[PDB]
Design a protein around this ligand. Structure first.
Ligand SMILES: Nc1ncnc2c1ncn2[C@@H]1O[C@H](COP(=O)(O)OP(=O)(O)OP(=O)(O)O)[C@@H](O)[C@H]1O
Ligand SMILES: [Mg+2]
Lengths: 316, 387
């Protein structure tokens, strides 16, 4: 694979089975995910009823940035009391299930999409507030810089979404800026991570990909995040900034852009691993050419003619 | 051939045979019997397979044979097959009429009494030998050395056993079996090679891994050194070509295989190995004779031939008096003289010793169990043959 899926594959496949099934069996399944997230899927009252539940260490921050109204909008009737030990929970009934195979497909997708629907709330808060500031700035272009200056400090979101990261984002009348305060703690990933983060910034400075968000990088923080909690300049973090302009989150694009920006650091983490799998296949190619430099030291003798299994043979 | 007594070391892996005063076996051959088989293998008009094929005739042709062994651990498992070795030994190796001949047999020190009885019964009643004697295999190996004291340890294909001797008295309470020898190291070599994926589980392939063990294996003198050469370096790797023409690579299995004589737990036995077995035997002898045993440990039998075994065994007894008698104090170690006798002939020392003993008693007709004495007392005629 060249780029990560946005949804949890297991919940998609599992619900695609049970929504097709004529005869459901019971389940009890904890299921890990990226960024320290964890799902629990089980059938607690009946084989007929699936409870999907989510655990995520920063969910208390995400409830401040309006998460429950987004989840109640998406999951509606299926929302349930949080399972003990989990932050959020949804109860889907296989007999009360939607009618068509394309309703079943989009419900199995929507429920597997839970990690990026819970982590989307601060992005929708920023996109919908930039739509207000875009109208206020269009009412007075000389007031607009001061609306941006106050929204840069008053409307800023920060999510400590895993212990070696922070995502910080804020609206201004023409953009949403998002900064990843990103660190690789595993030292062989820190060494490759310098290459992967540097070549990521140097890629944006080429004619082919000018249509993308303006990425920027440093290792100290952008001036407008220098006093956020957990952001510290000395601790060998790197500060990848994306500036999403109004053209990067136009109504056709918003949902792909939210899905695609959250997965950023996870594609670099995956591609650092998948680059070791590349360097190895390129190393064992050079080893196989050093074989030729030693083979010229073996004196020429014909090894005797043998059958395919190595047993001796008597012809020619 | 000769008018003197015939002598027969019917060993578990090799029969050796000849007469009194022979300086080396007149013949020796694998103690194997085979029956014809077809096996998705080569067939040839170059040889004719008879219904029973044995000894050299089988081992030279074993791709065509269901090979079977009449003996295990030094005891005859199947007498119908041992009869087909003994027929061959007398009638078409030696080419003898056994009627009234005298023969010396051998067996290990702690066999079932039913084995010696049915072996003597067969000598008196198939072949009709006029006189039989049976000697403990390790006391024969002491006549080969021209010697009368010092603990003799014999390791064969079937059994490893030890017999302390002092001033020609044989210490019957200290004689011992270690039920690990040249065959358990061969079943273990098959099991080490199976980890590499090489399979030798046909009955005829067992002689191929015997020849492979016998060619390539050695006893490590220092296990952390051979584990260094084994894990850090290619230098141990050796190519062996099977009679099939297949080549197989063998490496740590060169030292790690004969190590089971020093560490029987590798083959699932709880018994102590050669060094600790010889030490716990000498150190069980009375205080006045222990010096004369450590000053003359005698090795014997084919499984004592592994390259490095005399040096590993001597070291591993100096190393073990140091732990268990000096408690790790170096001050007295130079006073401990241990000597291993490891002569060039030692694979055949039981036969060469038997051929000496069968001269010493050739003319003393009361010393043998006679056929005329067997046919009146039965099995009780063998009570002549010591405690
Ligand atoms: N050089 C050697 N290296 C390793 N093993 C050897 C060597 N020479 C002989 N052997 C092994 O010794 C065994 C045969 O020895 P020997 O004739 O003394 O046994 P045996 O007398 O028939 O057995 P037993 O006394 O137990 O009845 C075989 O396992 C053979 O492979
Ligand atoms: Mg023997």
């Amino acid at each position: 694979m060249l780029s990560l899926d946005y949804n949890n594959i297991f919940i998609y496949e599992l619900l695609t089975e049970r929504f097709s099934s004529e005869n459901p069996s019971s389940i009890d399944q904890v299921v890990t995910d990226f960024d320290g997230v964890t799902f629990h899927i089980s059938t607690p009252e009946e084989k007929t009823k699936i409870l999907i539940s989510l655990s995520m260490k920063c969910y208390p921050e995400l409830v401040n940035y309006g998460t429950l109204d987004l989840l109640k909008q998406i999951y509606g009737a299926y929302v349930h009391e949080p399972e003990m030990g989990y932050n959020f929970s949804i109860l889907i009934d296989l007999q009360q299930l939607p009618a068509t195979d394309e309703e079943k497909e989009q419900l199995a997708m929507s429920i597997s999409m839970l990690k990026r629907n819970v982590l989307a709330a601060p992005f929708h808060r920023a996109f919908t507030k930039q739509a207000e500031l875009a109208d206020l700035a269009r009412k007075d272009p000389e007031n607009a810089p001061m609306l941006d200056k106050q929204a840069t400090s008053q409307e800023l979101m920060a999510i400590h979404y895993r212990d070696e990261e922070t995502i910080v984002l804020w609206p201004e009348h023409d953009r949403v800026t998002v900064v990843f305060s990103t660190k690789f703690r595993e030292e062989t990933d820190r060494i490759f991570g310098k290459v992967f983060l540097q070549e990521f910034v140097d890629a944006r400075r080429r004619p082919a990909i000018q249509t993308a968000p303006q990425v920027l990088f440093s290792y100290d923080p952008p001036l407008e995040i220098r006093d956020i909690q957990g952001i510290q300049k000395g601790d060998d973090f790197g500060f990848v900034t994306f500036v999403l302009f109004e053209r990067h989150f136009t109504p056709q694009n918003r949902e792909d852009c939210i899905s695609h920006i959250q997965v950023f650091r996870n594609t670099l983490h995956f591609h650092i691993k998948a680059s070791k799998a590349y360097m190895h296949q390129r190393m064992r190619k050079r080893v196989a050419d050093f074989q030729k430099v030693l083979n010229r030291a073996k004196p020429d003798v014909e090894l005797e003619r043998k059958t395919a299994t190595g047993r001796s043979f008597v012809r020619a | 051939m000769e008018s003197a007594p015939i002598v027969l070391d019917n060993g578990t892996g090799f029969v050796k045979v000849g007469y009194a005063k022979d300086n080396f076996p007149r013949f020796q051959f694998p103690s194997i019997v085979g029956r014809p088989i077809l096996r998705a293998e080569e067939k040839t008009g170059n040889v004719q397979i008879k219904d029973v094929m044995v000894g050299d005739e089988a081992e030279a042709v074993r791709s065509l044979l269901q090979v079977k062994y009449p003996m295990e651990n030094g005891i005859i498992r199947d007498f119908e097959e041992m009869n087909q070795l003994w027929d061959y030994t007398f009638f078409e190796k030696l080419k003898i009429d056994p009627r009234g001949r005298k023969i010396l047999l051998t067996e290990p020190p702690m066999n079932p009494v039913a084995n010696r009885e049915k072996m003597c019964e067969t000598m008196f009643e198939r072949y009709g030998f006029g006189g039989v004697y049976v000697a403990i295999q390790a006391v024969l190996s002491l006549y080969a050395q021209g010697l009368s004291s010092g603990v003799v340890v014999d390791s064969g294909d079937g059994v490893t056993h030890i017999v302390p001797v002092y001033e020609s008295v044989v210490l019957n309470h200290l004689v011992g079996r270690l039920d690990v020898a040249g065959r358990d190291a061969t079943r273990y070599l098959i099991s080490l090679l199976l980890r590499k994926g090489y399979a030798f589980n046909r009955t005829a392939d067992f002689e191929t891994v015997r020849e492979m063990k016998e060619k390539l294996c050695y006893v490590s003198y220092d296990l952390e050194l051979d584990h260094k050469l084994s894990e850090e370096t290619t230098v141990l790797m050796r190519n062996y070509t099977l009679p099939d023409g297949r080549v197989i690579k063998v490496g740590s299995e060169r030292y790690e295989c004969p190590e089971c004589l020093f560490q029987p737990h590798l083959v699932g036995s709880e018994q102590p190995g050669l060094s600790e077995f010889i030490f716990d035997t000498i150190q069980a002898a009375d205080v006045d004779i222990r010096k004369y045993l450590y000053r003359a440990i005698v090795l014997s039998g084919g499984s004592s031939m592994y390259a490095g075994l005399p040096s590993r065994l001597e070291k591993e007894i100096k190393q073990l008096w140091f732990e268990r008698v000096l408690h790790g104090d170096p001050a007295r170690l130079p006073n401990f003289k241990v000597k291993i006798e490891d002569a060039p002939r030692r694979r055949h020392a039981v036969f060469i010793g038997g051929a000496v003993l069968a001269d010493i008693m050739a003319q003393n007709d009361h010393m043998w169990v006679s056929k005329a004495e067997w046919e009146e007392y039965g099995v009780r005629a063998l009570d002549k043959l010591g405690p």
